[PDB]
Design a protein around this ligand. Structure first.
Ligand SMILES: CCCCCCCCCCCCCCCCCC(=O)OC[C@H](COP(=O)(O)OC[C@H](N)C(=O)O)OC(=O)CCCCCCCCCCCCCCCCC
Ligand SMILES: CCCCCCCCCCC(=O)O[C@H](COC(=O)CCCCC)COP(=O)(O)OCCN
Ligand SMILES: *[C@@H]1O[C@H](CO)[C@@H](O[C@@H]2O[C@H](CO)[C@@H](O)[C@H](O)[C@H]2NC(C)=O)[C@H](O)[C@H]1NC(C)=O
Lengths: 56, 50
């Protein structure tokens, strides 16, 4: 429950792993979101851009 | 010939989403990957603290 006290108590090499994981997971969690949104929108299809892509 | 999540065959026509997205045999497969990456990325920071 004392997460922010625990994070400080951890050694620096552990902090680097948590620093890395907390950001890599956040980048990759939303990577699946952007990939899926563009999948559902239908601009992922490798074809002529008749529509306007959801995220270019 | 890169790595394609859906079928790369038939000129990569498996990403078309006509007749509803849920009828895309690959998109439903994609929908089943999000519940796992959600937990894989929610608990990894929690477990690594422990
Ligand atoms: C039973 C066995 C248990 C073993 C537990 C230990 C596990 C260790 C894993 C070994 C690999 C770690 C590599 C870390 C490299 C940087 C750290 C380094 O060189 O040490 C420098 C120190 C860490 O030393 P310490 O004595 O452990 O410090 C504890 C601290 N005095 C404390 O107790 O409080 O750190 C500092 O002084 C902090 C300065 C940080 C600035 C450097 C920036 C780097 C950022 C991250 C870069 C890498 C990114 C990689 C991304 C990959 C993505 C795919
Ligand atoms: C939160 C972060 C973002 C998440 C990613 C974006 C999600 C896009 C997928 C939309 C979807 O899940 O698909 C819709 C149908 O979903 C449902 O009825 C809900 C049940 C299925 C979901 C559990 C589209 O329906 P449709 O009528 O075939 O739409 C196109 C044809 N008119
Ligand atoms: C592959 O995509 C194309 C276009 O959507 C289609 O392929 C042809 O579709 C016509 C429909 O009139 C058929 O007569 C041809 O025999 C199809 N050829 C091939 C090689 O498929 C079809 O929608 C898709 N086909 C497959 C097998 O995925």
């Amino acid at each position: 429950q004392d997460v922010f006290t625990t994070l400080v108590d951890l050694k620096w090499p552990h902090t680097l792993l948590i620093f890395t994981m907390s950001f890599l997971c956040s980048w990759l969690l939303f990577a699946m979101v952007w990939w899926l949104i563009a999948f559902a929108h239908g601009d992922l299809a490798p074809g002529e851009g008749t529509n306007v892509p959801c995220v270019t | 010939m890169p790595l394609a999540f859906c079928g790369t065959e038939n000129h990569s026509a498996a990403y078309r989403v006509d007749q509803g997205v849920l009828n895309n045999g690959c998109f439903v497969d994609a929908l089943n990957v999000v519940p796992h990456v959600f937990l894989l990325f929610i608990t990894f920071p929690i477990l690594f603290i422990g």
